[PDB]
C-alpha cells in the first residue's frame, strides 16, 4: 500500500519496492478499459495528478521553451504562459533536444 513515498530519480514516479512505500503500475490495459468505460476524470487523475505532475513554460510570441521564466530567443517578454504537463513529457522533450529535434508549442491560452 502507499499514500506518499519516495520517487524514482530519473522519473518522478513511485518506486517499485514493497519494503519501501512502493507503488502500483497503471498499465496500458487498465487505461484502455477506463477509456472504454468513459471515465476521464479517473484517467486524468491516475496519469497526471497522482502520477508525475510537473509544469512547463512556453513563450507565446515565439514557439519556444522558456526556463520567473525567461526567454533567451527574444528580449524579456511579459507574455509567457505555463502549461501543466506530466514530467514524462518534459523528459521526452529533453531527450528530443539531446538527439537533435526542436519542438514548437502553440498554446491556446
Amino acid at each position: 500500500f502507499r499514500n506518499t513515498g519516495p520517487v524514482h530519480p530519473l522519473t518522478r514516479q513511485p518506486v517499485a519496492d514493497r519494503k519501501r512505500f512502493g507503488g502500483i503500475k497503471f498499465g496500458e490495459m487498465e487505461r484502455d478499459c477506463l477509456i472504454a468505460h468513459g471515465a476521464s476524470a479517473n484517467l486524468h487523475e491516475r496519469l497526471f495528478t497522482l502520477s508525475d505532475s510537473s509544469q512547463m513554460h512556453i513563450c507565446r510570441k515565439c514557439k519556444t521553451y522558456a526556463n520567473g521564466p525567461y526567454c533567451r530567443v527574444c528580449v524579456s517578454s511579459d507574455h509567457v504562459v505555463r502549461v501543466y504537463v506530466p514530467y514524462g513529457a518534459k523528459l521526452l522533450c529533453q531527450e528530443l533536444f539531446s538527439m537533435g529535434i526542436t519542438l514548437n508549442f502553440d498554446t491556446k491560452l
Binding site: F1, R2, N3, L10, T11, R12, Q13, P14, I24, K25, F26, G27, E28, M29, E30, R31, C33, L34, H37, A39, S40, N42, E45, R46, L47, T49, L50, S51, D52, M56, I58, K63, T64, Y65, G68, P69, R72, V73, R82, V85, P86, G88, A89, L91, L92, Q94, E95, F97, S98, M99, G100, I101, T102, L103, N104, F105, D106, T107, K108, L109
Partner: protein, 387 residues
C-alpha cells in the same frame, strides 16, 4: 512572479539549428573540466544552482548548455539527402563539361554514405562506377586520368591522405564547396530545412537528467580531421534513450514506462479471498490497512471508512468489466480483502493466490463518475454478447 495558465495543442517538429541551440543554452562554457558545472544541474557536488534558487531537486529544472566547434560540420540527419543530391548534379558542371559527355573518357561517379565499412565514419564517399571502369579497361585505359579529381578543392587539412584513387572521402569543407553555385530553389526542394545544414554546436544534457558524459568531455577540445568530429557527434547522438539497443529502458520500452504506463499513489494490493456474506457491490477492506490509507475529503486527509468507493482491478485487464467500483466494507480480518465468489466471473480469477490491486480516488469528481459508470449495477449487461 505569476504567469497565465494555458492549454497546450498543435505541437510542431523541426531539426535543431545553431540559432535555437544557442538560444536555449544557458551559460555554455567551453572548459573541458566544466562539464559538471554548478550552473547546470543540482546533483553536482555543490548543492546550489547558479540560475535557480536552493531547492530539493523538485523546484529546479534541468538547464542546457551547448559547446562550440571550431570547424563547421554538416548535419548527419541531412547526410543522405546531400549525398543523393550530389549524385544527380555533376560536380564539374553545376547543371542537371568533361563529366557530362561519355566521349571524354571520364567515367560516371556515384556519391554514397559508408557506414563502418572503411574507416568507421558516416560520411560522403565518392566512388567511380565499376561497370564504367570495366568498359574503360577493355579500351586500354588501366588508370583514371590524373585530373579526374580536379573538381575537389584542395583541403588544407590534408591528414588521412594516401588513399585509393578510385574512392575518396569528401570532407565537410568540400561539401559546402560543391554546394556553391547550385540554384537555391533546387537545394530547398530536396532539403526543406536549409538553415539546419550548418551544425557548429552540440548541446550538453542536464546533469539532473543523465558514457555520454565521457564522450561530451572528449569533444570539448578537438584536433583537425573533421570526419572524426562527425563520427564522435554521431556516436554521442546514438546514446539517446529513444534509440534502440543495456538499461532496458530505451526505445519503445522508454515510451511505455515513461508516458504510457505510470505508477500512482493511494493504491493497495492484497490477496483476495471469498466471503459470501458481503454484498455483490461491497468489497472487504481490513481495518489495519484502511486506517493507514488516507483519502482527501473537503472540510486535509481522513482515513478510509464505510461508504467509500474503490476501483478494483485484476491484472491483466482483458475486458472492460475487469474494472469494477465497489463500496468499502471494513472487516475485522487483516492482511486480506474479501470478495463475493459470484463476482469472480467479471474478474476472471479464483481464490487461489490472486492479488487484486485497488485504486482510491482522491478527487470528488472521480468518485462521482466512478459509481455512475464503473459501478457493478451499471455493468449488469455484458457489452460483448448482450447477456
Amino acid at each position: 512572479l505569476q504567469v497565465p495558465v494555458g492549454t497546450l495543442t498543435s505541437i510542431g517538429f523541426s531539426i535543431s539549428n545553431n540559432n535555437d541551440r544557442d538560444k536555449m543554452s544557458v551559460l555554455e562554457v567551453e572548459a573541458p573540466n566544466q562539464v559538471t558545472d554548478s550552473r547546470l544541474g543540482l546533483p553536482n557536488p555543490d548543492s546550489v544552482c547558479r540560475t535557480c534558487g536552493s531547492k530539493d531537486r523538485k523546484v529546479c529544472e534541468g538547464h542546457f548548455g551547448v559547446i562550440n566547434f571550431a570547424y563547421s560540420i554538416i548535419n548527419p540527419y541531412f547526410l543522405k539527402e546531400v549525398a543523393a543530391l550530389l549524385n544527380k548534379i555533376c560536380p564539374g558542371c553545376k547543371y542537371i563539361c568533361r563529366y557530362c559527355t561519355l566521349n571524354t573518357g571520364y567515367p560516371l561517379m556515384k556519391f554514397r554514405v559508408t557506414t563502418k565499412e572503411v574507416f568507421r565514419r558516416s560520411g560522403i564517399v565518392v566512388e567511380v562506377n565499376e561497370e564504367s571502369l570495366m568498359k574503360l579497361k577493355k579500351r586500354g585505359v588501366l588508370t583514371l586520368p590524373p585530373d579526374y579529381w580536379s573538381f575537389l578543392p584542395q583541403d588544407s587539412n590534408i591528414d588521412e591522405s594516401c588513399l585509393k584513387p578510385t574512392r575518396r572521402i569528401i570532407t565537410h569543407a568540400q561539401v559546402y564547396a560543391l554546394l556553391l553555385g547550385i540554384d537555391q530553389r533546387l537545394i530547398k526542394k530536396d532539403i526543406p530545412m536549409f538553415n539546419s545544414l550548418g551544425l557548429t554546436s552540440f548541446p550538453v544534457t542536464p546533469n539532473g537528467y543523465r558514457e555520454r558524459t565521457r564522450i561530451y568531455k572528449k569533444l570539448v577540445g578537438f584536433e583537425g580531421n573533421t570526419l572524426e568530429l562527425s563520427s564522435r557527434v554521431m556516436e554521442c547522438m546514438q546514446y539517446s534513450r529513444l534509440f534502440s539497443e543495456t538499461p532496458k529502458l530505451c526505445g519503445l520500452r522508454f515510451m511505455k514506462d515513461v508516458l504510457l504506463g505510470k505508477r500512482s499513489d493511494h493504491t493497495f494490493r492484497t490477496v483476495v479471498v471469498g466471503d459470501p456474506s458481503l454484498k455483490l457491490n461491497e468489497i472487504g477492506i481490513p481495518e489495519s490497512i484502511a486506517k493507514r490509507l488516507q483519502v482527501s475529503e473537503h472540510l486535509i486527509f481522513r482515513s478510509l471508512m464505510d461508504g467509500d468507493t474503490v476501483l478494483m482491478n485484476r491484472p491483466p485487464s482483458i475486458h472492460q468489466h475487469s474494472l469494477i467500483a465497489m463500496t468499502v466494507r471494513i472487516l475485522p480480518t487483516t492482511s486480506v480483502v474479501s470478495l463475493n465468489p459470484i463476482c469472480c466471473l467479471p474478474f476472471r480469477g479464483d481464490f487461489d493466490g490472486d492479488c487484486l490491486h485497488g485504486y482510491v480516488p482522491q478527487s470528488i469528481q472521480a468518485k462521482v463518475e466512478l459509481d455512475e459508470l464503473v459501478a457493478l449495477d451499471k455493468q449488469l449487461i455484458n457489452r460483448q454478447n448482450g447477456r
